Amino acid sequence: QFAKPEDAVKYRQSALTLMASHFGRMTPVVKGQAPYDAAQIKANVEVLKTLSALPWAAFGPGTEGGDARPEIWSDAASFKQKQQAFQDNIVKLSAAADAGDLDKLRAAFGDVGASCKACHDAYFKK
Amino acid sequence: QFAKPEDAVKYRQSALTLMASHFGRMTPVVKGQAPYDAAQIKANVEVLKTLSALPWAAFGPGTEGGDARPEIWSDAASFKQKQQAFQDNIVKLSAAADAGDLDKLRAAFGDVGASCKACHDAYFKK
Ligand code: HEC
Ligand code: HEC
C-alpha cells in the first residue's frame, strides 16, 4: 500500500506511536496509581491487540529508512521471531484483561514491555 | 492519556494517518484496477473500523494545535455530529465488506470519502 519507502516509514512510525499510547496509558493502572476498571482495560487491550499487528507489514523489503536498523532485513527470520514473540506477549495481556485479573495483567504488562525493549535493542537506531 | 496538548496532536495525527492508509489502499480495488478478494477487504475494513473510532478522543478540550481548526471546540455538538456521521458511513462500508458485495462496497466507499471531506471543509486548516 506504499508508493515509496517514505510512505512505509510514515505508516510504521504512526502505528508504533499509537501502540506506545495504548500500552503506556495503562502504566498508572498497573501501578495502582489509577483505578482498575476491568471493562475499560479489556476494551483498551483489544485496541492494542489490533494495533500491535500493524507495524510489521510496513517493514517490507527495500523500506530502509527512519530509525530502523538495517539488520531487520539481513535476517528476516530473526526479526519475524521478535515481532511474533511480542505479539504472543500481547496475547497473554489480552487473556489477563479478558479475565479481569489484575495480577495477571501486571505480570503480562511487564513482559510486554520487556519484549518491546528486546526488539529495540537489536533493531532500533538509538 | 496525554501529558500535553502536543501529545494529543501527535496521537490524532498518527491515527488519522493510519486511517488514510487503510481507507486509501482500497481505492484500486473499488476501481477494479486491483482484484477483489472479499476476505482481504473484510479484514481490512475491520482494521479501518477500529482506527476510525480513535482520533476523536484526542481532540479533548484545550488540545488546540496541529492543523485542527478552533471551530472544533466552539461548537462541540456540531463536531460530534460530523465524527458520528463519518463513523456511521464506516458502518455502511463494514456491512458491504462483510456481505462481500462489491457494488455496495463502491457506493459506501464514495460516501465515506465524502464524509472525510465534509469534516475537513469545516475543521481542517488548509
Ligand atoms: C520489533 C519486533 C519491535 C517491537 C516488538 C516494538 N518495536 Fe518499537 N520500533 C521498532 C522499530 C524498528 C522502530 C523504528 C521505526 C522507524 O522506521 O523509524 C520502532 C519505533 C518505535 C517508536 C517511535 C515511532 C515514531 O514516532 O517514529 C515508538 C513510540 C515505539 N517504537 C514504541 C514501541 C512500544 C511501546 C512497543 C511495545 C508495546 C514496541 N515499540 C515494540 C521495532 C519494534
Ligand atoms: C472530522 C470529524 C474528521 C473526519 C471525519 C476525518 N478527518 Fe481527517 N482530519 C481532521 C482534522 C481536524 C485533522 C487535523 C488534525 C491535527 O491536529 O492536525 C485531520 C487530519 C487528517 C490527516 C493528516 C494527519 C497528519 O499526518 O497530520 C489525514 C491523512 C486525514 N485527516 C485523513 C482523513 C481520512 C482519509 C478521512 C476519512 C477516511 C478523514 N481524515 C476523516 C478531521 C477529520
From Swiss-Prot, chains A, B:
PTM text: Binds 1 heme c group covalently per subunit.
Record-level GO cellular component terms: periplasmic space
Name recorded for this polypeptide: Cytochrome c'
Localization, UniProt: Periplasm
Residue sites binding heme c per the record: 12-13, 67, 116, 119-120
Record-annotated disulphide pairs: none
Subunit: Homodimer.
Keyword tags: Electron transport, Heme, Iron, Metal-binding, Periplasm, Pyrrolidone carboxylic acid, Transport
One MF annotation (Gene Ontology) recorded for this entry: iron ion binding
Positions where Pyrrolidone carboxylic acid occurs in the chain: 1
Superkingdom assignment: Bacteria
Summary of the function given for this chain in its UniProt record: Cytochrome c' is the most widely occurring bacterial c-type cytochrome. Cytochromes c' are high-spin proteins and the heme has no sixth ligand. Their exact function is not known.
UniProt xrefs under Pfam families: Cytochrom_C_2 (PF01322)
UniProt-listed GO biological process terms: electron transport chain
InterPro entries to which the protein is assigned, alphabetical: Cyt_c/b562, Cyt_c_II, Cyt_c_prime, Cyt_c_prime_subgr
PROSITE patterns: CYTCII (PS51009)
